[PDB]
Design a protein around this nucleic acid. Structure first.
Length: 267
DNA sequence: GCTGATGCGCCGACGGATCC
DNA sequence: GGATCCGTCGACCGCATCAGC
């Protein structure tokens, strides 16, 4: 069944208006993504912070368009020394660091009232050849997140490469041995929520909404049929839940095999 | 400099078996 | 014997290097 995201809810349930818009997007190659008009969509979406995964592009090779972004001028990039992530912000963060204590997968940015983590979580791979590394990575990531020195609440966003529950992908049955839906990956996601702790922003708001996905394989015209997976998330500290206005899946923005996702927070 | 082949990371379709 | 379950197989893209002109 096709899906259409509900309209933007820009006011918190108590009634306070959204003041921060965060967008996260696995762009499947930043240079290709830009040529496919990805930046045009970002300008229309006008977020305060933009998080990119799978940039596939070192900093010296960033297209010039990216320094034509006056509303997203504080830019931070991290590539492995493939992969690669980026963080663009209207305002300067107080602190930026890379890694989880050069894989080019995690950027941590401290702002006034929260800490933003963007992550491109390692894929378990075809035939699950990298699953044990992913499980070991998951545990190190959890420890890093909880061990964060600040008492500020956390926003974790990006491509976490796991469909948490069956409702999060079109074909749960045929995929329980595929990357992104092993019991090992699903369990790691549950542990992240419990350990840190964190809430799945989109699911806290739409706990029973099926067919909402953020990735479709390029093969077999899967996106036309909305045969997809929900791999990209905004995960929120419990104390940020009153500030949560909405969590969006921008199904119609093309340019990658992932679509953008957008968080509205009332801070 | 530029192209194209190649390699690498990144599952839905389909055919067959089992179940009531 | 339709529904379900299970294992098999071909394949979209972007980016790298390499070979040749």
């Amino acid at each position: 069944a096709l899906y259409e995201d509900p309209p933007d809810q820009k006011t918190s349930p108590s009634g306070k208006p959204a003041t921060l818009k965060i967008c996260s997007w696995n762009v499947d190659g930043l240079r290709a993504w830009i040529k496919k008009k990805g930046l045009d969509w970002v300008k229309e979406e006008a977020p305060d912070i933009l998080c990119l995964q799978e940039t596939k592009c070192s900093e010296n090779k960033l297209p010039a368009e990216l320094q034509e972004l006056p509303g997203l001028s504080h830019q931070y990039w991290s590539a492995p020394s493939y992969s690669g992530v980026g963080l663009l912000s209207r305002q300067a963060p107080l602190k930026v660091s890379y890694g989880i204590g050069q894989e080019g997968r995690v950027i941590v940015a401290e702002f006034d009232s929260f800490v933003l983590v963007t992550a491109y979580v390692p894929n378990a791979g075809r035939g699950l050849v990298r699953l044990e590394y992913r499980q070991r990575w998951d545990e190190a990531f959890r420890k890093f997140l909880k061990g964060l020195a600040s008492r500020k609440p956390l926003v974790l966003c990006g491509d976490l490469n796991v469909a948490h529950e069956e409702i999060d992908l079109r074909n749960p049955k045929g995929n329980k041995k595929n990357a992104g839906f092993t019991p090992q990956e699903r369990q790691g996601f549950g542990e992240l929520l419990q350990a840190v702790p964190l809430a799945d922003s989109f699911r806290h708001l739409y706990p029973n909404t099926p067919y909402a996905y953020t990735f479709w394989t390029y093969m077999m015209n899967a996106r036309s049929k909305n045969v997809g997976w929900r791999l990209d998330y905004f995960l929120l500290s419990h104390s940020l839940l009153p500030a949560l206005c909405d969590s969006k899946i921008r199904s119609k923005a093309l340019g990658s095999d992932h679509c953008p996702i957008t968080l509205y927070l009332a801070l």
